[PDB]
Amino acid sequence: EIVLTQSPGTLSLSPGERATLSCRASQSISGYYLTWYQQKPGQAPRLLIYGASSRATGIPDRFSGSGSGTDFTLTISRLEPEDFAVYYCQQYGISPVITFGGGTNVEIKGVQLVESGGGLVQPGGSLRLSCAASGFTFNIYDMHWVRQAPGKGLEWVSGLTTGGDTSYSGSVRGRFSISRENAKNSLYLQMNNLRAGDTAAYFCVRGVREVGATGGDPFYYAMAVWGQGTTVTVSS
Amino acid sequence: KSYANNKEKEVLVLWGVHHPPNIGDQRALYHTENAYVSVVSSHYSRKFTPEIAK
Amino acid sequence: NCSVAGWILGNPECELLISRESWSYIVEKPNPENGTCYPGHFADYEELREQLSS
Ligand SMILES: *[C@@H]1O[C@H](CO)[C@@H](O[C@@H]2O[C@H](CO)[C@@H](O[C@@H]3O[C@H](CO)[C@@H](O)[C@H](O)[C@@H]3O)[C@H](O)[C@H]2NC(C)=O)[C@H](O)[C@H]1NC(C)=O
Ligand SMILES: *[C@@H]1O[C@H](CO)[C@@H](O[C@@H]2O[C@H](CO)[C@@H](O)[C@H](O)[C@H]2NC(C)=O)[C@H](O)[C@H]1NC(C)=O
C-alpha cells in the first residue's frame, strides 16, 4: 500500500482558530478508506473522523474535513488547549495493508483489550506477545498489530482477516508470526530475529466487522477500538 | 452480467438474495433501500425486491 | 407445423379453422415449428393443455 504524506507534522496556532490538515498519498484512493485519530503523549490514541467527512461517537462537531482521491483532508472549526495533541492518518489498503501518516502535533500557543508481555529481549533473539479479549465477540472483527516509536511516525506491523488472508510488510514478514483464537478470546504474536527497529511501543487493535452477525454493531472501514499497548526493546 | 453454455452439457446454477436484519448494513454496504434484482432466462425468470424483516 | 400457441392465438400461418368445432383428438409433431412470433413466457402450458385435452 501507498506512501502517505501528512501536512504538517507539527503546527503552532492560537485559541479561537480553525486548523486545516491535509494527508495525501501517491495515488487516488477512494475516500471511505481513511480514518483520523488523536493522541495525547502518555495516552493511547483516540478516534475522531472517518471517510473524509463523517464523525465518530461521543463528540463535539468542530473537527470536520473533506477531500477525495489523492488528497484527503481534515479541518478543524475551533482550537482549544485541551486539544494539545498529535493527530494521525490511518488507511486500509486494497492490498490489505494499513498505512500511516506520521503524526501531526497541534501546539496551542498562549469492551476492552489487554496486552501481554512487553519488555526486553536480546537483539537477534526471540520472544512472544499476546493480547486477550474482554466483553465482545472476537470471532467477528479483523485484527491488527501496530507499532509506534516514541514521538515518531507510526508503522504498521501486521494484520489479518478472520478468514486467514494475512497482511504484513515485506520487511517485517517472516520474522514475526501471528495466530488467532476466538474460542479462547485471545491473540498471539510469536516474534524472532529482532533488531533495534522494534525498539518501540506496540498496540493490539480491533478493526472491522467482516460482513455479518447479530448485534448493535455497525461497521466502518476504520477501527473499532484500541488497546493500551506496551513497550518492547532489544538491548544488551 | 450473463452467461450461456459453450460446454454443451447441462448446467446447474445457484444464487441468493440478501435480507438483512437491520438497515444500517443495507445503507452502509449497498447504499439503497431499494432492492431490485432480476435473474432471468428464457424459460425461467424472476425478480426480487425485499426489505428488512427482523 | 404449428404450436398450440400458434393454434390458439391466431398465428396467420396457423390456419384458424373456426369450422373445426369439436374433434376426435389433437395431433402435433414432437418438435413444433411455429411457436410465438413475439416470444414471452407462456405460463401454465401444462394446465391449458390438460384443459384442452378434450
Ligand atoms: C413459422 O415457422 C417457420 C419455420 O421455422 C419460420 O420460418 C423460419 O424462421 C427462421 C427464424 O430464424 C428463419 O431464419 C431466419 O431468417 C431471417 C431471414 O429471413 C434471418 O434474419 C434470421 O437471422 C434467420 O436466419 C428461416 O429462414 C425461416 N424459414 C422459412 C422457410 O420461413 C416462420 O418464421 C414461422 N412463422 C411464424 C409466424 O411463426
Ligand atoms: C412445415 O415445415 C416444413 C419445413 O421442413 C415446410 O417445408 C417447406 O415447404 C416449402 C413449400 O411449401 C418449401 O419451399 C420449403 O423449402 C420447405 N422447407 C423445408 C425445410 O422442407 C412446410 O411447408 C411447413 N408446413 C406448414 C404447413 O407450415
CSV table of C-alpha atoms and ligand atoms in Angstrom, one decimal:
chain,number,residue,atom,x,y,z
A,1,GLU,CA,0.0,0.0,0.0
A,2,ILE,CA,0.9,3.6,-0.7
A,3,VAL,CA,3.1,6.2,0.9
A,4,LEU,CA,1.1,8.9,2.6
A,5,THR,CA,2.3,12.4,3.5
A,6,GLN,CA,0.6,14.4,6.2
A,7,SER,CA,0.7,18.2,6.1
A,8,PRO,CA,2.0,19.4,8.7
A,9,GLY,CA,3.7,17.1,11.1
A,10,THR,CA,3.7,19.9,13.6
A,11,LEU,CA,1.9,23.3,13.8
A,12,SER,CA,1.6,26.1,16.3
A,13,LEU,CA,-1.7,28.1,16.5
A,14,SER,CA,-3.8,30.2,18.9
A,15,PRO,CA,-7.2,29.8,20.6
A,16,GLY,CA,-10.4,30.7,18.7
A,17,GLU,CA,-8.9,29.4,15.4
A,18,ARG,CA,-9.5,26.7,12.8
A,19,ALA,CA,-6.9,24.2,11.7
A,20,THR,CA,-6.5,22.7,8.2
A,21,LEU,CA,-4.5,19.4,7.9
A,22,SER,CA,-4.1,17.6,4.5
A,23,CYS,CA,-3.0,13.9,4.4
A,24,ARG,CA,-2.4,12.9,0.8
A,25,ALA,CA,-0.8,10.0,-0.9
A,26,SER,CA,0.8,8.9,-4.2
A,27,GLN,CA,-2.3,7.7,-6.0
A,28,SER,CA,-6.1,8.5,-5.8
A,29,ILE,CA,-7.6,6.1,-3.3
A,30,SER,CA,-11.4,6.2,-2.9
A,31,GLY,CA,-12.5,8.1,0.2
A,32,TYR,CA,-14.3,5.8,2.6
A,33,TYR,CA,-10.8,4.5,3.2
A,34,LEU,CA,-9.1,6.7,5.7
A,35,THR,CA,-9.7,7.3,9.4
A,36,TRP,CA,-8.3,10.0,11.7
A,37,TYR,CA,-7.0,9.9,15.2
A,38,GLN,CA,-5.6,11.9,18.1
A,39,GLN,CA,-3.1,11.1,20.8
A,40,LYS,CA,-2.0,12.8,24.0
A,41,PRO,CA,1.5,11.5,24.7
A,42,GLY,CA,1.1,9.2,27.6
A,43,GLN,CA,-2.4,8.3,26.4
A,44,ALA,CA,-3.4,5.8,23.8
A,45,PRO,CA,-4.9,7.0,20.5
A,46,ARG,CA,-8.5,8.3,20.3
A,47,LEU,CA,-10.7,8.1,17.2
A,48,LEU,CA,-12.3,11.1,15.6
A,49,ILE,CA,-13.2,11.0,11.9
A,50,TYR,CA,-13.5,8.6,9.0
A,51,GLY,CA,-14.1,8.6,5.3
A,52,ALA,CA,-13.1,12.3,4.9
A,53,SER,CA,-16.5,13.5,6.2
A,54,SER,CA,-18.0,11.7,9.0
A,55,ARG,CA,-17.8,11.7,12.7
A,56,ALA,CA,-17.3,9.1,15.5
A,57,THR,CA,-19.3,8.6,18.7
A,58,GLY,CA,-19.2,10.8,21.8
A,59,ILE,CA,-18.2,14.1,20.2
A,60,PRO,CA,-18.3,17.8,19.6
A,61,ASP,CA,-18.8,19.0,16.0
A,62,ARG,CA,-15.6,21.0,15.4
A,63,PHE,CA,-13.2,18.5,13.8
A,64,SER,CA,-14.6,18.2,10.3
A,65,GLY,CA,-13.0,17.6,6.9
A,66,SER,CA,-13.4,16.8,3.2
A,67,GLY,CA,-11.3,15.7,0.3
A,68,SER,CA,-11.1,12.8,-2.0
A,69,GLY,CA,-8.8,10.7,-4.2
A,70,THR,CA,-5.2,11.6,-3.8
A,71,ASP,CA,-5.8,14.4,-1.2
A,72,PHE,CA,-7.7,13.6,1.9
A,73,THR,CA,-8.3,16.4,4.4
A,74,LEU,CA,-9.3,17.0,8.0
A,75,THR,CA,-10.1,20.6,9.0
A,76,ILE,CA,-11.0,21.9,12.5
A,77,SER,CA,-13.5,24.6,13.3
A,78,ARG,CA,-12.1,25.7,16.7
A,79,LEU,CA,-8.8,25.2,18.5
A,80,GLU,CA,-8.6,24.7,22.3
A,81,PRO,CA,-5.6,24.0,24.7
A,82,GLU,CA,-7.2,20.7,25.6
A,83,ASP,CA,-6.7,19.6,22.0
A,84,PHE,CA,-2.8,19.7,22.5
A,85,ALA,CA,-2.0,16.5,20.6
A,86,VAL,CA,-0.6,14.5,17.7
A,87,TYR,CA,-3.3,13.6,15.1
A,88,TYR,CA,-2.8,10.6,12.8
A,89,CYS,CA,-3.9,9.3,9.4
A,90,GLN,CA,-4.7,5.5,9.0
A,91,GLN,CA,-5.8,4.0,5.7
A,92,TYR,CA,-6.9,0.5,4.8
A,93,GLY,CA,-5.1,-0.7,1.6
A,94,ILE,CA,-6.7,-2.8,-1.1
A,95,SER,CA,-3.5,-4.6,-0.8
A,96,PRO,CA,-5.0,-5.1,2.8
A,97,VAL,CA,-2.2,-3.1,4.4
A,98,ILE,CA,-2.8,-0.2,6.8
A,99,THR,CA,-0.6,2.8,6.0
A,100,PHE,CA,0.1,5.6,8.4
A,101,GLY,CA,0.7,9.3,8.2
A,102,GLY,CA,3.5,10.3,10.7
A,103,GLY,CA,1.6,12.3,13.3
A,104,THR,CA,0.6,15.9,13.3
A,105,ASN,CA,1.2,17.9,16.5
A,106,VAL,CA,-1.1,20.8,17.4
A,107,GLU,CA,0.6,23.2,19.7
A,108,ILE,CA,-1.8,25.7,21.3
A,109,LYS,CA,0.0,28.9,21.9
A,110,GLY,CA,-0.8,31.2,24.8
A,111,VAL,CA,-15.3,-4.0,25.9
A,112,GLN,CA,-11.6,-3.8,26.3
A,113,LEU,CA,-8.4,-5.5,25.3
A,114,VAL,CA,-5.4,-6.3,27.4
A,115,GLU,CA,-1.9,-6.8,26.0
A,116,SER,CA,0.6,-9.2,27.5
A,117,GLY,CA,4.4,-9.4,27.6
A,118,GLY,CA,6.1,-6.2,26.7
A,119,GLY,CA,9.7,-5.8,27.8
A,120,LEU,CA,13.3,-6.7,26.9
A,121,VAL,CA,15.0,-9.3,24.8
A,122,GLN,CA,18.5,-9.7,23.4
A,123,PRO,CA,18.9,-8.5,19.8
A,124,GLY,CA,18.6,-11.2,17.2
A,125,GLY,CA,16.7,-13.2,19.8
A,126,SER,CA,13.1,-14.4,20.4
A,127,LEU,CA,10.1,-13.5,22.4
A,128,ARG,CA,6.2,-13.7,22.2
A,129,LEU,CA,3.4,-11.3,23.0
A,130,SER,CA,-0.3,-11.9,23.4
A,131,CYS,CA,-3.5,-10.0,23.7
A,132,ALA,CA,-6.7,-11.1,25.4
A,133,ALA,CA,-10.2,-10.0,24.9
A,134,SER,CA,-12.9,-8.7,27.3
A,135,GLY,CA,-16.6,-8.4,26.7
A,136,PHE,CA,-17.4,-8.9,23.0
A,137,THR,CA,-17.2,-11.5,20.1
A,138,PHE,CA,-13.5,-11.8,19.0
A,139,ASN,CA,-15.0,-14.0,16.2
A,140,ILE,CA,-16.0,-11.2,14.1
A,141,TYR,CA,-13.5,-8.4,13.7
A,142,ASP,CA,-10.4,-8.1,11.5
A,143,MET,CA,-7.5,-7.5,13.9
A,144,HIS,CA,-4.3,-5.5,13.7
A,145,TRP,CA,-1.0,-5.4,15.5
A,146,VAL,CA,0.6,-1.9,15.2
A,147,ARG,CA,3.9,-0.2,16.2
A,148,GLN,CA,4.9,3.3,17.2
A,149,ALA,CA,8.3,4.7,18.2
A,150,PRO,CA,8.3,7.5,20.8
A,151,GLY,CA,7.3,10.8,19.2
A,152,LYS,CA,7.7,9.5,15.7
A,153,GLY,CA,5.6,8.5,12.7
A,154,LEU,CA,3.9,5.2,13.2
A,155,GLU,CA,4.5,1.9,11.4
A,156,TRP,CA,2.0,-1.0,10.8
A,157,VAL,CA,3.5,-4.4,11.6
A,158,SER,CA,0.7,-6.8,10.7
A,159,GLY,CA,-3.0,-7.6,10.5
A,160,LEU,CA,-5.2,-10.4,9.5
A,161,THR,CA,-8.8,-11.0,8.4
A,162,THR,CA,-10.8,-13.6,10.2
A,163,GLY,CA,-10.7,-15.9,7.2
A,164,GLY,CA,-6.9,-16.1,7.0
A,165,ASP,CA,-5.6,-13.6,4.5
A,166,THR,CA,-2.6,-12.2,6.2
A,167,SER,CA,-1.1,-8.8,5.5
A,168,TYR,CA,2.5,-8.0,6.6
A,169,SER,CA,5.1,-5.6,5.2
A,170,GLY,CA,7.8,-7.2,3.1
A,171,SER,CA,10.5,-6.2,5.6
A,172,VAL,CA,8.6,-7.4,8.7
A,173,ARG,CA,7.3,-10.6,7.2
A,174,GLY,CA,8.7,-13.9,8.4
A,175,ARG,CA,10.5,-12.6,11.4
A,176,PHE,CA,7.1,-12.1,13.2
A,177,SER,CA,4.2,-14.6,13.1
A,178,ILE,CA,0.6,-14.1,14.1
A,179,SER,CA,-2.1,-16.6,15.2
A,180,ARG,CA,-5.6,-16.1,16.5
A,181,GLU,CA,-8.1,-17.8,18.8
A,182,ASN,CA,-11.8,-17.0,19.1
A,183,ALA,CA,-13.0,-19.7,21.4
A,184,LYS,CA,-10.3,-18.6,23.9
A,185,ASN,CA,-10.9,-14.9,23.2
A,186,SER,CA,-7.2,-14.1,22.6
A,187,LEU,CA,-4.5,-13.3,20.1
A,188,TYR,CA,-0.8,-14.4,19.8
A,189,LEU,CA,2.3,-13.0,18.1
A,190,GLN,CA,5.4,-15.1,18.2
A,191,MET,CA,8.4,-13.0,17.3
A,192,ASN,CA,12.0,-13.9,16.3
A,193,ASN,CA,15.0,-12.3,14.7
A,194,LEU,CA,14.6,-9.0,16.5
A,195,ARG,CA,16.7,-5.9,16.0
A,196,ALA,CA,16.6,-2.2,17.1
A,197,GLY,CA,13.9,-1.3,14.6
A,198,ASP,CA,11.5,-3.0,17.1
A,199,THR,CA,12.8,-0.7,19.9
A,200,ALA,CA,9.4,1.0,20.3
A,201,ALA,CA,5.9,0.7,21.7
A,202,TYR,CA,3.2,-1.6,20.2
A,203,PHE,CA,-0.6,-1.8,20.2
A,204,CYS,CA,-3.2,-4.5,19.7
A,205,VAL,CA,-6.1,-3.1,17.7
A,206,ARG,CA,-9.7,-4.2,16.8
A,207,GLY,CA,-11.0,-3.2,13.4
A,208,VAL,CA,-13.6,-4.4,11.0
A,209,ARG,CA,-16.9,-6.2,11.3
A,210,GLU,CA,-16.5,-8.5,8.4
A,211,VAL,CA,-20.0,-8.9,6.9
A,212,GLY,CA,-22.4,-10.3,9.4
A,213,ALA,CA,-23.7,-11.3,12.8
A,214,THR,CA,-26.3,-10.1,15.3
A,215,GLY,CA,-25.5,-7.0,17.3
A,216,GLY,CA,-25.9,-3.3,17.8
A,217,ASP,CA,-22.6,-3.1,16.0
A,218,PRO,CA,-22.4,-1.3,12.7
A,219,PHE,CA,-19.2,-1.1,10.7
A,220,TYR,CA,-16.8,1.3,9.1
A,221,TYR,CA,-13.6,0.6,7.3
A,222,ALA,CA,-12.0,2.4,10.2
A,223,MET,CA,-11.0,0.9,13.5
A,224,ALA,CA,-13.4,-0.1,16.2
A,225,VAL,CA,-11.3,0.3,19.3
A,226,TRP,CA,-7.6,0.1,20.5
A,227,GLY,CA,-5.6,-1.3,23.4
A,228,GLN,CA,-3.2,0.4,25.9
A,229,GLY,CA,-0.2,-1.0,24.1
A,230,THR,CA,3.2,-1.9,25.6
A,231,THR,CA,6.9,-1.3,25.2
A,232,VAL,CA,9.3,-3.8,23.5
A,233,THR,CA,13.1,-3.4,23.1
A,234,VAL,CA,16.2,-5.3,22.2
A,235,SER,CA,19.2,-4.3,24.3
A,236,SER,CA,22.5,-5.6,25.7
B,1,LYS,CA,-23.9,-9.8,-16.3
B,2,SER,CA,-24.8,-13.0,-18.1
B,3,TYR,CA,-23.6,-16.4,-19.3
B,4,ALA,CA,-24.7,-19.1,-21.8
B,5,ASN,CA,-23.3,-22.5,-22.4
B,6,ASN,CA,-20.4,-23.3,-24.6
B,7,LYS,CA,-19.7,-26.6,-22.8
B,8,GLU,CA,-22.8,-28.3,-24.5
B,9,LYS,CA,-23.6,-30.1,-21.2
B,10,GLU,CA,-26.4,-29.1,-18.8
B,11,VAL,CA,-25.6,-26.6,-16.1
B,12,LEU,CA,-26.7,-26.1,-12.5
B,13,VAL,CA,-26.6,-22.6,-11.0
B,14,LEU,CA,-27.2,-21.1,-7.6
B,15,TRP,CA,-27.6,-17.6,-6.2
B,16,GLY,CA,-29.0,-15.7,-3.3
B,17,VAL,CA,-30.9,-12.6,-2.2
B,18,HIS,CA,-29.9,-10.6,0.9
B,19,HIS,CA,-32.4,-9.9,3.6
B,20,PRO,CA,-30.6,-8.0,6.4
B,21,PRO,CA,-31.9,-8.0,10.0
B,22,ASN,CA,-31.1,-4.2,10.2
B,23,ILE,CA,-30.9,-1.4,7.7
B,24,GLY,CA,-27.6,0.1,8.7
B,25,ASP,CA,-25.9,-2.7,6.9
B,26,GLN,CA,-28.1,-2.1,3.8
B,27,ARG,CA,-27.3,1.6,3.5
B,28,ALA,CA,-23.6,1.0,4.5
B,29,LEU,CA,-22.9,-1.8,2.1
B,30,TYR,CA,-25.1,-1.2,-0.9
B,31,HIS,CA,-26.4,2.4,-0.4
B,32,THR,CA,-30.0,1.7,-1.5
B,33,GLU,CA,-33.1,1.0,0.5
B,34,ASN,CA,-34.4,-0.1,-3.0
B,35,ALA,CA,-34.0,-3.8,-3.6
B,36,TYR,CA,-34.5,-4.8,-7.3
B,37,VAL,CA,-32.8,-7.9,-8.7
B,38,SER,CA,-33.8,-9.7,-11.9
B,39,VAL,CA,-32.4,-13.2,-12.5
B,40,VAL,CA,-33.7,-14.1,-15.9
B,41,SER,CA,-33.7,-16.8,-18.6
B,42,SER,CA,-36.0,-17.8,-21.4
B,43,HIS,CA,-38.0,-20.4,-19.6
B,44,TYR,CA,-37.4,-19.2,-16.0
B,45,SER,CA,-37.4,-15.6,-14.9
B,46,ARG,CA,-37.9,-13.9,-11.6
B,47,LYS,CA,-37.2,-10.7,-9.8
B,48,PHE,CA,-36.7,-9.8,-6.1
B,49,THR,CA,-37.4,-6.6,-4.1
B,50,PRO,CA,-37.1,-7.4,-0.3
B,51,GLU,CA,-36.9,-5.3,2.8
B,52,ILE,CA,-35.5,-5.6,6.3
B,53,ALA,CA,-37.5,-8.2,8.2
B,54,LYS,CA,-36.3,-8.8,11.8
C,1,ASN,CA,-46.3,-27.5,-38.1
C,2,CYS,CA,-47.9,-25.3,-35.5
C,3,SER,CA,-47.6,-25.0,-31.8
C,4,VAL,CA,-50.6,-24.9,-29.6
C,5,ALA,CA,-49.7,-21.3,-29.0
C,6,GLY,CA,-49.8,-20.8,-32.8
C,7,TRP,CA,-53.1,-22.5,-33.0
C,8,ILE,CA,-54.9,-20.8,-30.1
C,9,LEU,CA,-53.7,-17.3,-30.6
C,10,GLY,CA,-54.2,-16.8,-34.3
C,11,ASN,CA,-50.8,-17.0,-36.0
C,12,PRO,CA,-51.7,-16.4,-39.7
C,13,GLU,CA,-49.6,-19.4,-40.9
C,14,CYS,CA,-51.7,-21.4,-38.5
C,15,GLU,CA,-55.0,-21.8,-40.3
C,16,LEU,CA,-57.6,-20.7,-37.7
C,17,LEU,CA,-60.1,-23.3,-38.8
C,18,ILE,CA,-63.2,-22.0,-36.9
C,19,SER,CA,-65.3,-24.6,-38.7
C,20,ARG,CA,-63.4,-27.2,-36.5
C,21,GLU,CA,-65.9,-27.2,-33.7
C,22,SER,CA,-65.1,-30.4,-31.9
C,23,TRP,CA,-63.0,-33.4,-32.9
C,24,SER,CA,-61.6,-36.8,-32.1
C,25,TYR,CA,-58.1,-35.8,-30.9
C,26,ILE,CA,-55.3,-33.4,-31.2
C,27,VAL,CA,-52.3,-34.1,-33.4
C,28,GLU,CA,-48.9,-32.4,-33.1
C,29,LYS,CA,-45.4,-33.2,-34.1
C,30,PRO,CA,-42.8,-33.5,-31.3
C,31,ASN,CA,-40.7,-30.5,-32.4
C,32,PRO,CA,-43.3,-28.0,-33.4
C,33,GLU,CA,-42.0,-25.2,-35.7
C,34,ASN,CA,-44.2,-22.3,-35.1
C,35,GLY,CA,-44.0,-21.0,-31.6
C,36,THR,CA,-44.8,-17.4,-31.0
C,37,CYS,CA,-43.6,-14.8,-33.4
C,38,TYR,CA,-43.0,-12.4,-30.5
C,39,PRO,CA,-41.7,-14.5,-27.6
C,40,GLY,CA,-42.7,-14.3,-24.0
C,41,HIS,CA,-43.3,-16.6,-21.1
C,42,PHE,CA,-46.4,-18.6,-21.5
C,43,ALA,CA,-47.3,-19.8,-18.1
C,44,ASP,CA,-49.3,-22.9,-17.2
C,45,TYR,CA,-48.8,-24.5,-20.6
C,46,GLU,CA,-49.5,-27.9,-18.9
C,47,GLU,CA,-52.8,-26.8,-17.4
C,48,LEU,CA,-54.1,-25.3,-20.6
C,49,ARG,CA,-53.2,-28.5,-22.5
C,50,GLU,CA,-54.9,-30.7,-20.0
C,51,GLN,CA,-58.0,-28.4,-20.2
C,52,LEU,CA,-57.8,-28.7,-23.9
C,53,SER,CA,-57.3,-32.5,-23.7
C,54,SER,CA,-61.0,-32.8,-24.7
D,1,LIG,C1,-43.2,-20.4,-38.8
D,1,LIG,O1,-42.2,-21.4,-38.9
D,1,LIG,C2,-41.2,-21.2,-39.9
D,1,LIG,C3,-40.3,-22.3,-40.0
D,1,LIG,O2,-39.5,-22.4,-38.8
D,1,LIG,C4,-40.5,-19.9,-39.7
D,1,LIG,O3,-39.6,-19.6,-40.8
D,1,LIG,C5,-38.2,-19.7,-40.5
D,1,LIG,O4,-37.8,-18.8,-39.4
D,1,LIG,C6,-36.4,-18.8,-39.2
D,1,LIG,C7,-36.2,-17.9,-37.9
D,1,LIG,O5,-34.8,-18.0,-37.5
D,1,LIG,C8,-35.7,-18.2,-40.4
D,1,LIG,O6,-34.4,-17.9,-40.2
D,1,LIG,C9,-34.1,-16.5,-40.1
D,1,LIG,O7,-34.2,-15.9,-41.4
D,1,LIG,C10,-34.1,-14.5,-41.4
D,1,LIG,C11,-34.2,-14.0,-42.8
D,1,LIG,O8,-35.5,-14.1,-43.3
D,1,LIG,C12,-32.8,-14.0,-40.7
D,1,LIG,O9,-32.9,-12.6,-40.5
D,1,LIG,C13,-32.6,-14.7,-39.4
D,1,LIG,O10,-31.4,-14.4,-38.8
D,1,LIG,C14,-32.8,-16.3,-39.5
D,1,LIG,O11,-31.7,-16.7,-40.4
D,1,LIG,C15,-36.0,-19.2,-41.5
D,1,LIG,O12,-35.4,-18.7,-42.7
D,1,LIG,C16,-37.5,-19.3,-41.8
D,1,LIG,N1,-37.8,-20.3,-42.8
D,1,LIG,C17,-38.9,-20.2,-43.6
D,1,LIG,C18,-39.0,-21.3,-44.6
D,1,LIG,O13,-39.8,-19.4,-43.4
D,1,LIG,C19,-41.5,-18.7,-39.6
D,1,LIG,O14,-40.9,-17.5,-39.3
D,1,LIG,C20,-42.6,-19.0,-38.6
D,1,LIG,N2,-43.7,-18.0,-38.7
D,1,LIG,C21,-44.5,-17.7,-37.7
D,1,LIG,C22,-45.5,-16.6,-38.0
D,1,LIG,O15,-44.4,-18.3,-36.6
D,2,LIG,C1,-43.7,-27.3,-42.3
D,2,LIG,O1,-42.3,-27.2,-42.2
D,2,LIG,C2,-41.6,-27.6,-43.4
D,2,LIG,C3,-40.1,-27.4,-43.0
D,2,LIG,O2,-39.4,-28.6,-43.2
D,2,LIG,C4,-42.0,-26.7,-44.5
D,2,LIG,O3,-41.3,-27.1,-45.7
D,2,LIG,C5,-41.2,-26.1,-46.8
D,2,LIG,O4,-42.1,-26.2,-47.8
D,2,LIG,C6,-42.0,-25.2,-48.8
D,2,LIG,C7,-43.1,-25.4,-49.8
D,2,LIG,O5,-44.4,-25.4,-49.2
D,2,LIG,C8,-40.6,-25.3,-49.5
D,2,LIG,O6,-40.4,-24.2,-50.4
D,2,LIG,C9,-39.5,-25.2,-48.4
D,2,LIG,O7,-38.2,-25.3,-48.9
D,2,LIG,C10,-39.8,-26.3,-47.4
D,2,LIG,N1,-38.7,-26.3,-46.3
D,2,LIG,C11,-38.2,-27.4,-45.8
D,2,LIG,C12,-37.1,-27.2,-44.7
D,2,LIG,O8,-38.5,-28.5,-46.2
D,2,LIG,C13,-43.5,-26.9,-44.7
D,2,LIG,O9,-44.0,-26.1,-45.8
D,2,LIG,C14,-44.2,-26.5,-43.4
D,2,LIG,N2,-45.7,-26.7,-43.5
D,2,LIG,C15,-46.6,-25.8,-43.0
D,2,LIG,C16,-48.0,-26.2,-43.2
D,2,LIG,O10,-46.2,-24.8,-42.4
